[PDB]
Amino acid sequence: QEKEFLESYPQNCPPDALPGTPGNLDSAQEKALAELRKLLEDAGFIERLDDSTLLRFLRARKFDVQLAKEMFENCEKWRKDYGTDTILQDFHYDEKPLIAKFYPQYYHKTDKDGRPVYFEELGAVNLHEMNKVTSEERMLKNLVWEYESVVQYRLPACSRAAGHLVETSCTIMDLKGISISSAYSVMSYVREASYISQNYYPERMGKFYIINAPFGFSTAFRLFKPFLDPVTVSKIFILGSSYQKELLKQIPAENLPVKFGGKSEVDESKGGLYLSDIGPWRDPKYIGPEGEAPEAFS
Numbered sequence: 365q366e367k368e369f370l371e372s373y374p375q376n377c378p379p380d381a382l383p384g385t386p387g388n389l390d391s392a393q394e395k396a397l398a399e400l401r402k403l404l405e406d407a408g409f410i411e412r413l414d415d416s417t418l419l420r421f422l423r424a425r426k427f428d429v430q431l432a433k434e435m436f437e438n439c440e441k442w443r444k445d446y447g448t449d450t451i452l453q454d455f456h457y458d459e460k461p462l463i464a465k466f467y468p469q470y471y472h473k474t475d476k477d478g479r480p481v482y483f484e485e486l487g488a489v490n491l492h493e494m495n496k497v498t499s500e501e502r503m504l505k506n507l508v509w510e511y512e513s514v515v516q517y518r519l520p521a522c523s524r525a526a527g528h529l530v531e532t533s534c535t536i537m538d539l540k541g542i543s544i545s546s547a548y549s550v551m552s553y554v555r556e557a558s559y560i561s562q563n564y565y566p567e568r569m570g571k572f573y574i575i576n577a578p579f580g581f582s583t584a585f586r587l588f589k590p591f592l593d594p595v596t597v598s599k600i601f602i603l604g605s606s607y608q609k610e611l612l613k614q615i616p617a618e619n620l621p622v623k624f625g626g627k628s629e630v631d632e633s634k635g636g637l638y639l640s641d642i643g644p645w646r647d648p649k650y651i652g653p654e655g656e657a658p659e660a661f662s
């Protein structure tokens with residue numbers, strides 16, 4: 365199944381993409397990739413040795429082969445202990461219709477480069493109400509579940525729809541309603557989620573828009589700017605109460621939801637935006653041999 369699944373969708377990043385992305389390797393990047401491939405092979409590894417996976421790890425370690433082998437090995441260790449390799453069957457987030465309003469997290473269509481768009485309304489989160497029903501451990505299970513649906517279903521379909529490899533998502537994080545107090549209360553979840561993201565899903569973040577940022581924090585960020593990695597800085601966007609134009613630059617109006625200033629609508633019979641999962645991975649044109657992605661609840 366390994367070799368056919370990847371033949372089922374375009375595997376080249378567009379050429380104007382960052383160096384070391386599939387299809388765009390120079391000689392040395394190619395040598396390093398072959399080298400790390402063989403080094404993992406000899407260690408007795410089989411699956412997930414494709415070009416995309418390994419160039420993500422390498423980009424994450426600036427193509428240092430040894431540290432990339434390291435990070436890969438730790439990631440597989442975590443996959444075994446956590447049960448990731450089967451979570452899509454094992455875990456069932458039956459509470460979602462109940463607690464979605466208390467931490468809106470949802471995927472919706474694609475940006476102009478073909479990336480699935482991911483939305484988190486962090487500033488509206490109410491862990492008081494969420495903790496009446498579920499736990500942080502289960503929230504993180506759902507997050508990994510969603511990441512696995514991204515990798516196994518959302519990205520292959522997005523790649524077919526865009527005509528080229530799609531490896532990343534475009535995140536929109538709404539800060540409207542945030543406070544120091546609610547920051548402390550979400551701190552533990554956000555830090556766990558980040559750890560998972562950076563270490564077991566490297567280079568999956570393509571854009572990261574913060575919107576309704578408080579005036580203070582964005583001024584601060586412009587001064588603090590040199591302290592971050594320049595690539596990371598170019599993927600980040602701080603915006604205030606008027607973000608609609610800058611979002612509509614990156615996401616077609618019929619893809620971006622109305623409440624953020626586009627034209628895309630969801631009908632509230634199914635439970636509206638917070639419970640939806642609309643995009644090319646639900647489109648018969650783009651669903652491939654992997655089948656359609658599972659729904660999160662029934």
Ligand SMILES: CCCCCCCC/C=C\CCCCCCCC(=O)O[C@@H](COC(=O)CCCCCCCCCCCCCCC)COP(=O)([O-])OCC[N+](C)(C)C
Pocket residue numbers: 537539542543544547554557558559561562574578579580581583584587588
């Ligand atoms: C080199 C020298 C440079 C330094 C000098 C700098 C000079 C500084 C000068 C002036 C500044 C004035 C200070 C007051 C600012 C208060 C704002 C504030 O605290 O924000 C809020 C907290 O909100 C947050 O927590 C903000 C960030 C949200 C989370 C970011 C992403 C998290 C998820 C991603 C994680 C990783 C994802 C990826 C992981 C893989 C509190 O809101 P508030 O109190 O109601 O705001 C007041 C309103 N006002 C600000 C307009 C008045």
Ligand SMILES: O=C(c1ccc(Cl)c([N+](=O)[O-])c1)N1CCN(c2ccccc2F)CC1
Pocket residue numbers: 482484510511512514515531532533535537554557558561562565568569
């Ligand atoms: O690195 C990521 C990330 C990680 C895995 C996957 Cl599968 C994807 N993806 O959809 O292609 C993105 N993200 C940046 C961090 N983001 C995040 C981290 C912590 C809290 C909230 C957040 F939105 C989530 C998205």
